[PDB]
Amino acid sequence: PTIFEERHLKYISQLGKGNFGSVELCRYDPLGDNTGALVAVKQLQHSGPDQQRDFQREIQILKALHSDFIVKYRGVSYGPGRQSLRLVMEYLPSGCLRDFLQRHRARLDASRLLLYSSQICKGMEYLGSRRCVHRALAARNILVESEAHVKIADFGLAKLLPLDKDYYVVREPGQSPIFWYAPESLSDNIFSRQSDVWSFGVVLYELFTYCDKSCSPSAEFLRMMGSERDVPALSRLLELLEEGQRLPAPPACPAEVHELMKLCWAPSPQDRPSFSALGPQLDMLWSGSR
């Protein structure tokens, strides 16, 4: 059931492009009559050994996860030849949360944003119990299953912590979404479940601004970086964060949610709340808003 025959996967279109991979909308059509199920299928391009190995990892992690708040693994496929591997996932046609929020802002109220917040937190709690660091977490990689149900996706950078270590360190990445990363990740290449909490804070910011491009993290940075313009962004961001500067409270954001953001952005990773501590608070806020 989890082995899709490659010759029966029919390409329709591209859903996402990464540095080394893409996610493609396909039909699995073993009857050949175009009646099969639609699936989302990841494969690599421009991939060396490291990228192949990371993709094997991604598959094993996602296959093991069973949460209502994590995109469903379906199976794998292999073509003929070297570098044949494909990851088959459920397809969610409503697309990503980032696009969904911008399209439907005028009808998605604070209660609904609280619901999405709580669901994403529950998915991160699930990951944490499996010692998985997601790293990529952002509104652009969270999927909308229905208007009242979201799921975490893009496990391309996900990694399991060793049983006896609560962080990992990588070599300097070439291309990072710098405005989502914890300072220890930006400066020392350290990632953990605590750096995931920082990113979740930025997700809460994305939710409560409806991903408006006028107040995106990059826009706020360009406003707050100061009058000196030709300064490298990463350098300057690290200085602003060290000085204690943070993204502003969105006008429509409940004060209690802004306070949770601030705690997610504590300087010291050990001072940030766990997802297990955040969950109850978001659950109480959501349930009080129904």
Ligand X SMILES: C[C@@H]1CCCC[C@@H]1n1c(-c2ccc(/C=C(/C#N)C(=O)N(C)C)o2)nc2cnc3[nH]ccc3c21
Ligand Y SMILES: NC(=O)Nc1ccccc1
Is 157 among the residues that bind ligand X (CB under 6 A)? no
The correct pick among 26, 62, 96, 133 for binding ligand X (CB under 6 A) is 96
Q: What is the dihedral of CA 246, 247, 253, 255, to 10 degrees?
A: 10
Q: Give the 3-state secondary structure of residue 94.
A: coil
- Tell me how far CA of residue 21 lies from CA of 40, 87, 108, 181, 185, in angstroms: 13, 11, 32, 21, 23
| Contact code string over 128-167 relative to ligand Y, x by CB under 6 A | ----------------------------------------
Using CB under 6 A, count the residues that bind ligand X.
Answer: 18
Residue 190 to residue 168: CA distance in whole angstroms = 6
x/- track of binding to ligand Y for residues 250-279 (CB under 6 A): ---------------x--------------
Residue 16 is a binding residue for ligand X (CB under 6 A): yes
- Two tokens, residue 267: 């300087």
Q: Does 40 bind ligand X (CB under 6 A)?
A: yes
Residue in 140, 149, 236, 246 binding ligand X, rule: CB under 6 A: 140
Quote the CA–CA distance of 75 and 59 in Å, as a whole number: 9
Q: How many positions of this chain bind ligand Y (CB under 6 A)? A: 11
- Residue 65: both structure tokens together: 């996860």
- Sole window of 49-57, 84-92, 193-201, 241-249 interacting with ligand X (rule: CB under 6 A): 84-92
Supply 277's token pair. Answer: 């501590």
The residue (of 6 and 90) whose beta carbon lies closer to ligand X is 90
One-character DSSP codes across 172-226: PPSS--GGGS-HHHHHH-EEEHHHHHHHHHHHHHHHHTTT-GGGSHHHHHHHHS-
**Which residues contribute to the site for ligand X (CB under 6 A)?**
15-16, 23, 40, 71, 89-92, 95-96, 98-99, 140-141, 143, 153-154
**Which residues contribute to the site for ligand Y (CB under 6 A)?**
179, 202, 217, 220-221, 224, 240, 245-247, 265
